[PDB]
Symmetry: C3
Subunit: 277 residues, 3 copies
């Protein structure tokens, strides 16, 4: 199962809302904001019009990485493209396919693992908004990219995973053989290293080698810093079997302070050998 | 147009000089030192003889990354390849084309985005010299590489850009459609993440995909540490239009403290929409 | 030195965890010969390795590997009850596989790469104390046809140390001009680092050398790394640069200043190293 060629013009509503404990999040439905924000998926060539509403009492913005946007959708104070309290704005994201330019150079397409976040809450860099939870994933697919059975987003935000209390995962479940996609985003002040037990991926656009000629390093550990994003697909349990497979930041004190979760890979009967919570 | 094949013997004079406020810099002519130092450009195969003079009252050196040099041009005190106050020395850098070794393996060429810096001021690692401004860019081009309309060098040195006071850019100007080359160098104590608004590049040698078979990740954000260097070319405003396009370190406190500048992309008439200083 | 053959052998080795002087701990293949870093394990894709492991210490220890195939019983974690109690024995099994085309039409990557093993239970359930103490080592998995080196050297940036050594004590490595030298670079602990070698450069890809004229990988001499990262490469000693005492170091300025530096001593065939004067 593979992504089709893109070129659809899509529309969605998005809201920025306050959540419990001083947090803030994005959502597609009023009153249902989440941290991380909703996953937005596009095929190269698609256009997305985000009909955005700020329900909070502070100005907020939406800034996206990687995609094509004009200055009016930059989402910064510099370009007066933030949204006043209670205000509305349509942010527009475009994407393009790769292709040969007339001068013979190759223009890269938009495809990749990307993300969106606030750029105006607290500081002109969005330090408050990002700390509070205003971030989410974007995936742009190229025609023919393999589609996963499930997608999970892991954000290292300062010393938290997904703004959760320490030592609370999140955990993600799969069955042996599932094609599982991970989107990995980092935000805030610190560098991290992301590691998965029992699984590995290629350090390239899709996380999978294109074939026998792709020299990309195969890895299970990767250094990342604020606003980095990457992603990959794995076959759950491939060559290793079912089990509670931990993922964690590998900076030692970060793991000791709770930047750890479980990739729970189940047998067909739904059980997980050796896992006794 | 495009870079030709190299193989010329080139020469330049270089001086290390004190600048205002305890700073130090390299320059090609006496009294003309700059931070960053002068851009050196070579084609693979070229040899460069750097006729160097230390005009300061403390020893200094010149050490280069990536290029070929004999141990006598290492630029360290350990083999006495530094330059005493008032002294002169010729440092020689060579470069080579790619090609197959007699052992059957492929030898990479010298081409890339590189840099030179001091190795003896303050400590035998050059900590004081680098802090003071003794660093600059070197580009080595491969035959057939596309040539840019302009080149700009951005150095994250500790918590400054190009040793400038916080919140002073620098800014760079272009017109929509210009082919703009960025050289990005990091120095000092801290990791950083370089981000550009409105533009992106391939994480490979040139910043441009070689064609449809290149699997390199396309990015707009990249983690870097002391002495890392990379570069890329972008088409100014491609798919996004004119405007003041922010670049910054994405480590949140670094952006907030002033590691931010503007890529000012003008319409053909010279105006920048939505921008007034 | 030739090229790696196709794998598929079942191999066995004894490994011991032992205390070393000064609160340290290391792995070894023979009792009383533990080292930091631990012994280099080399496998060809398809090989299986049974590590007959014995913990000779008075505290629990484990063995956890990156990159290779292992079942949950060889995870080497307390949460999977695959640690080794004091005085205990356990067989840890690592498997490896070749690349190939899957049933779903996609390409499955092989196990080949520069990997590493380390403790996961000493001090904390992340192995923080064991890693600090020295319980880490390299493991290389080769693909059929990979070029073999004349020598392999392992450089571990563990916190503010290289290979747990006292500051300003190297290590140094020797080669002759033209030798094919393999470096395995591992990082552990709390800090990011940047590894730099004077006079030498490599491709930022699986093997450290470009596969040919179509490989677009960046060529570098400086690389940022963080805890549990591993990479490796092969260089031709002195290629285009000649003999000399070629420094390698972390390029984070305070780290170099505190002594995270060593020497790659490249000699001419007659043994000379121009200008070397320690
Ligand atoms: Cu920004
Ligand atoms: Cu972390
Ligand atoms: Cu692991
Ligand atoms: Cu951003
Ligand atoms: Cu150095
Ligand atoms: Cu920074
Ligand atoms: Cu941005
Ligand atoms: Cu350097
Ligand atoms: Cu672990
Ligand atoms: Cu370091
Ligand atoms: Cu150097
Ligand atoms: Cu690990």
């Amino acid at each position: 199962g593979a992504a089709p060629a893109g070129g659809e013009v899509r529309r969605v509503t998005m809201y920025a809302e306050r959540l419990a404990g001083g947090q803030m999040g994005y959502g597609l439905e009023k009153g249902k904001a989440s941290i991380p924000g909703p996953l937005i998926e596009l095929n190269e060539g698609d256009t997305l019009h985000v009909e955005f509403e700020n329900t909070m009492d502070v100005p907020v913005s939406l800034h996206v990485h990687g995609l094509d946007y004009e200055i009016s959708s930059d989402g910064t104070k510099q370009n007066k493209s933030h949204v006043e309290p209670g205000g509305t704005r349509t942010y527009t994201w475009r994407t393009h396919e790769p292709g040969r330019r007339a001068d013979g150079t190759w223009r890269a397409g938009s495809a990749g693992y990307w993300h969106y976040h606030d750029h105006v809450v607290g500081t002109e860099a969005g330090t408050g908004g990002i700390r509070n939870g205003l971030y989410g994933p974007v995936i742009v697919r190229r025609k023919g990219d393999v589609l996963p059975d499930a997608t999970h987003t892991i954000v290292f935000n300062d010393m938290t995973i997904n703004n959760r209390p320490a030592h609370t995962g999140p955990n993600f479940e799969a069955t042996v053989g599932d094609r599982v996609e991970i989107v990995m985003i980092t935000h805030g002040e610190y560098y991290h290293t992301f590691h998965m037990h029992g699984h590995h991926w290629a350090d390239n656009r899709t996380g999978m080698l294109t074939g026998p000629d792709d020299p990309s390093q195969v890895i299970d550990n990767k250094i990342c810093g604020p606003a980095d994003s990457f992603g990959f697909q794995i076959i759950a349990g491939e060559g290793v079997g079912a089990g509670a497979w931990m993922y964690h930041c590998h900076v030692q004190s970060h793991s000791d302070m709770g930047m750890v979760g479980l990739f729970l890979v189940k047998k067909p009967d739904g059980t997980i050998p050796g896992y006794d919570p």
